[PDB]
């Protein structure tokens, strides 16, 4: 590493190198916390956790309680030990508190004065960070599984919100329009994910083991429908073309937006052209995953690029461009159901059915 | 009678089975679909609709 | 120096005594501070018999386990590393797995493992935030009645 | 004891699948179970046409 110093000190190497070898260095040494701790207040499992986009220093967390958490993950205090203190929480006496589990909850991007939540009490709520109050509710007739806003969209401000219904909802910020409707599946709709790259792409992954890319500004239903074999198999498109051999519970774009992954439930994740849908064959062997409901996984970003996906009872990061296994991050006590990634400091934020959000920093 | 019960936890009908271990004098009562679990005492008189009480009324005490 | 160790801790673990034989453990004690390859073989040594259908020689070595943990650090390095396995062993949480016969043996088991856990927790919880989160979970989520 | 971790604990058997399987029935397989196909076919134990 003094050669990566003198290296940058010279001109050698771009200080690209340095950070982005440094970044890789660090998540490989991704280790359980030796001096931080989160406070625990969830009573239920952890379904779903979010730093902000901006700044990164807040993290929302949605329990099968129904309670939202907003925690504050940096060390204010002079110690090397400290705990992530919570600022806010949406708990059982707020008069807004969401009947049943939250499932999803994200910070609204390209600002933090706002959120966004959805449980299987049918509820999308849009909540006011400052006053902590509703802003908006947008009532589904059947219960939520996954939502999902562009983190690109400076124009339009679209919450994907996939439900028991075979249909994908697209409800607008702007105009509070929740009409809008994708058609084109066939079961529940597990997970939804914005592309980083294109405004109006968007892809959505149900029970029907297909996975599907939207252009949504479109009126001519799904652009690509992801299929394992590339068309070995191929066959008059009715239940063929599809992305696993289960249901797809879980989708995650690159970090440059120009492949995605997708878990699903036959123990099996995949890698795919995010242009052209093709399967690039990237094997990651077996991935134990059997979650009825949608499974969030999150990829690195600034390093010289991984995966960590929730594999049982621990974190299986993988090299997403080889499928190499790093290794396991075994520190939950029940299986994790989120994991988010700081990227500013290479840290990992996991939680699970046993009511603990675990911080993993590299050692 | 009734013996799959709405869960209060998921709100998903008849999700809850209950399993009576008379051996042992123990219901325990687990949502199928968010995997939740309860564990109470019962007699010989109890059913499933007493373990399912129970739980209600565990859960209620629990959240005051 | 393998042998004379396997040995020992055959005797120990085998006899089902409700109680450690002293001079014995004693031996234990110095042939287990002699090396720390060797106390860590002692630690699968336990961790093997652990797995094995008895409660009496769960109770020997998770009385063992117990004595090391107290008496060593690494050792408690060793074992908050695969605590998960420990807890699943001695307190049988996971209902697919049961803990063995008998179930005198069983039920000693489960309130010697509970105090002894309470006093790692007071001891050396601070030391191994992994034993807190361990405790922590058996406190709340498996509702262990630490005051039975 | 479903053949896969996980597939379907409990499904309702709509008409239209019932009238799936019977059609594949082989012509052998159904005078074993005792229904000449000359003047009796399982599917037809379905109703389609009124
Ligand atoms: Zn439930």
């Avoid at chain 1, 909540?127 to 902590?132: A, G, P, R, V």
């Avoid at chain 3, 040594?45 to 998770?62: D, G, K, N, Y």
Wanted: glycine share 6%; with cysteine.
């Amino acid at each position: 590493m003094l050669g990566f110093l003198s290296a940058r000190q010279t001109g050698l190497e771009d200080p690209l190198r340095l950070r982005r070898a440094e970044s890789t260095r660090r998540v490989l040494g991704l280790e359980l916390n030796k001096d931080r701790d989160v406070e625990r207040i969830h009573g239920g499992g952890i379904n779903t956790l979010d730093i902000e986009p901006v700044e990164g220093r807040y993290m929302l967390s949605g329990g099968s309680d129904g309670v939202i958490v907003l925690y504050d993950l940096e060390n204010s205090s002079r110690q090397s030990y400290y705990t992530c203190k919570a600022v806010c929480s949406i708990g059982r006496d707020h008069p807004d508190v969401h009947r049943y589990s939250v499932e999803t909850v994200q910070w609204y991007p390209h600002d933090t004065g706002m959120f966004t939540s959805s449980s299987f009490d049918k509820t999308l709520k849009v909540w006011d960070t400052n006053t902590l109050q509703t802003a908006d509710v947008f009532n589904f007739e059947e219960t939520v599984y996954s939502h999902h806003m562009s983190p690109v969209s400076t124009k339009h401000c679209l919450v994907a919100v996939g439900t028991r219904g075979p249909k994908v909802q697209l409800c607008d910020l702007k105009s509070g329009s929740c009409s809008h409707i994708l058609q084109g599946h066939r079961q529940e709709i597990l997970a939804v994910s914005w592309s980083p790259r294109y405004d109006y792409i968007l892809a959505t992954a149900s029970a029907d083991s297909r996975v599907k890319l939207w252009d949504v500004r479109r009126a001519s239903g799904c652009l690509i429908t992801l299929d394992q074999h590339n068309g070995k198999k191929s066959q008059a498109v009715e239940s063929a073309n599809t992305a696993h051999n289960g249901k797809v519970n879980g989708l995650c774009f690159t970090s440059d937006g120009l492949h995605l992954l997708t878990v699903g439930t036959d123990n099996r994740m995949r890698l795919w052209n995010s242009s052209n849908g093709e399967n690039t064959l990237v094997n990651y062997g077996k991935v134990c995953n059997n979650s009825k409901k949608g499974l969030k996984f999150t990829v690195s970003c600034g390093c010289s690029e991984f995966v960590f996906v929730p594999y049982g009872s621990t974190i299986a990061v993988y090299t997403v461009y080889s499928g190499e296994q790093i290794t396991m991050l075994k520190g939950h006590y029940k299986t994790v159901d989120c994991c988010v990634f700081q990227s500013n400091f290479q840290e990992l934020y996991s939680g699970s059915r046993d009511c603990n959000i675990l911080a993993w920093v590299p050692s | 009678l009734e013996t799959q019960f709405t869960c209060p936890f998921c709100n998903h009908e008849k999700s809850c089975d209950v399993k009576m271990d008379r051996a042992r004098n123990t219901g325990v009562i687990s949502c199928t679909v968010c995997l939740e679990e309860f564990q109470t005492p019962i007699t010989y008189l109890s059913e499933p609709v007493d373990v399912y009480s129970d739980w209600i009324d565990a859960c209620e005490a629990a959240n005051q | 120096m393998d042998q004379k160790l396997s040995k020992l801790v055959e005797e120990l673990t085998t006899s089902g005594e409700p109680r450690l034989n002293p001079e014995k453990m004693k031996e234990l004690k110095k042939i287990c501070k002699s090396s720390e390859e060797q106390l860590s073989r002692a630690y699968r040594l336990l961790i093997a018999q652990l797995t094995q259908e008895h409660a009496e020689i769960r109770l020997s070595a998770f009385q063992i386990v117990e004595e090391l943990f107290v008496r060593s650090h690494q050792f408690r390095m060793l074992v908050v590393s695969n605590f998960q396995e420990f807890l699943e062993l001695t307190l049988g949480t996971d209902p697919a797995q049961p803990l063995p016969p008998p179930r005198e043996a069983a039920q000693r088991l489960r309130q010697a493992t509970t105090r002894a856990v309470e006093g790692w927790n007071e001891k050396f919880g601070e030391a191994y935030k992994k034993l807190a989160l361990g405790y922590h979970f058996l406190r709340h989520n498996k509702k262990v009645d630490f005051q039975d | 004891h479903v053949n896969e971790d996980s597939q379907e604990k409990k499904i309702l058997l709509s008409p239209e699948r019932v009238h799936e399987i019977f059609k594949r029935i082989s012509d052998e397989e159904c005078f074993v179970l005792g229904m000449e196909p000359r003047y009796a076919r399982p599917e037809w134990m379905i109703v389609t046409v009124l």
